[PDB]
Structure 1
């Protein structure tokens, strides 16, 4: 019996906890992506930095969700964190394709939560997502899309050259 809880459904509380798991999973995926590009046999520093900064962003998104859970009077509940889908991530192109899949999944989870909030008439939740998540995700996905296009135009008949140049001149 929380003294502050008001207009905060058990459905939203549960879905926030699920979303925290999804963001921490994504953080973990990006940690693995980063360290893969730091391997001496991969050695793409800008690519490593791109993903390591996304691991931090996703961690921060989970903590924002956790703060909000406590502000609303819900209870944070943590579950096991699955490991990333792959141990090795291929080329930069392969990695950026996996990243945009991942971000699309996070975006769909945000949209689903927003729809739940709207069904539960929880405007504080709706505002929260609008303020801190939805535009961030659109912006990120757009950038990834721009990167994919630049990566793909650089493949040509000289894929290693293009992978180097992209890392050097964009990342």
Structure 2
């Protein structure tokens, strides 16, 4: 069949395609989050920029998976990409909570694929995830948790003031 394929299971090939779908879904979710915060009636530039940057980061993860699929001799298969779970994302707090939920779901999918690779004795796959995905996800989730704690401490009894200050003094703007 394939001239280069070696030690690459059909199970891993399919899970890789599924993970591409998840990362592209996540990228699309972040595009929607970013543009919501650019609305004139939301207007939080640093929050917009944060999520637009994450849309690109998730796309780059999908791109790396597609490069790897071909390096291994599998075949990329694309599926429909479902729209994000919400049209309007509420407050910065609500948005950051949704993002952490999204990231935990990508992380579990990475861990599930790592376990499949381990079970199939596919060390290239396992190394690929360890080298380019697992620590990146851990670092991002830590950042998001740090942000959640700071957003929550700023709510107090003046939510608008806190949401403005977080965007201006923590998030980068521009």
TM bucket, shorter chain:
over 0.9
For the residue of structure 1 that corresponds to 2:83, the secondary structure is coil
What is the TM-score of this pair, normalised by structure 2? 0.98
Q: CA deviation at 1:17?
A: 0.1
Q: CA deviation at 1:159?
A: 0.1
Partner Cα distance (2:17, 2:81) in 1? 12
Structure 2's unaligned 5+ residue stretches are: none
Q: CA deviation at 1:158?
A: 0.1
Q: CA deviation at 1:169?
A: 0.1
Q: CA deviation at 1:117?
A: 0.1
Q: CA deviation at 1:61?
A: 0.2
Partner Cα distance (2:119, 2:73) in 1? 20
Partner Cα distance (2:64, 2:163) in 1? 35
Number of residue-to-residue matches in the alignment: 171
1:64-102 superposed Cα distances (whole Å, 9 cap, x missing partner): 000000000000000000000000000000000000000
Q: CA deviation at 1:166?
A: 0.1
Partner Cα distance (1:14, 1:45) in 2? 38
Q: CA deviation at 1:142?
A: 0.2
What is the TM-score of this pair, normalised by structure 1? 1.00
Partner Cα distance (1:15, 1:156) in 2? 44
Partner Cα distance (2:157, 2:23) in 1? 37
Partner Cα distance (1:19, 1:144) in 2? 22
1:122-157 superposed Cα distances (whole Å, 9 cap, x missing partner): 000000000000000000000000000000000010
Partner Cα distance (2:127, 2:2) in 1? 22
Q: CA deviation at 1:170?
A: 0.1
Deviating beyond 2 angstroms after TM superposition, the runs of 4 or more aligned structure 1 residues are: none
Structure 1's unaligned 5+ residue stretches are: none
For the residue of structure 2 that corresponds to 1:115, the secondary structure is helix
Partner Cα distance (2:126, 2:76) in 1? 19
Q: CA deviation at 1:13?
A: 0.1
Partner Cα distance (1:70, 1:158) in 2? 52
Q: CA deviation at 1:116?
A: 0.2
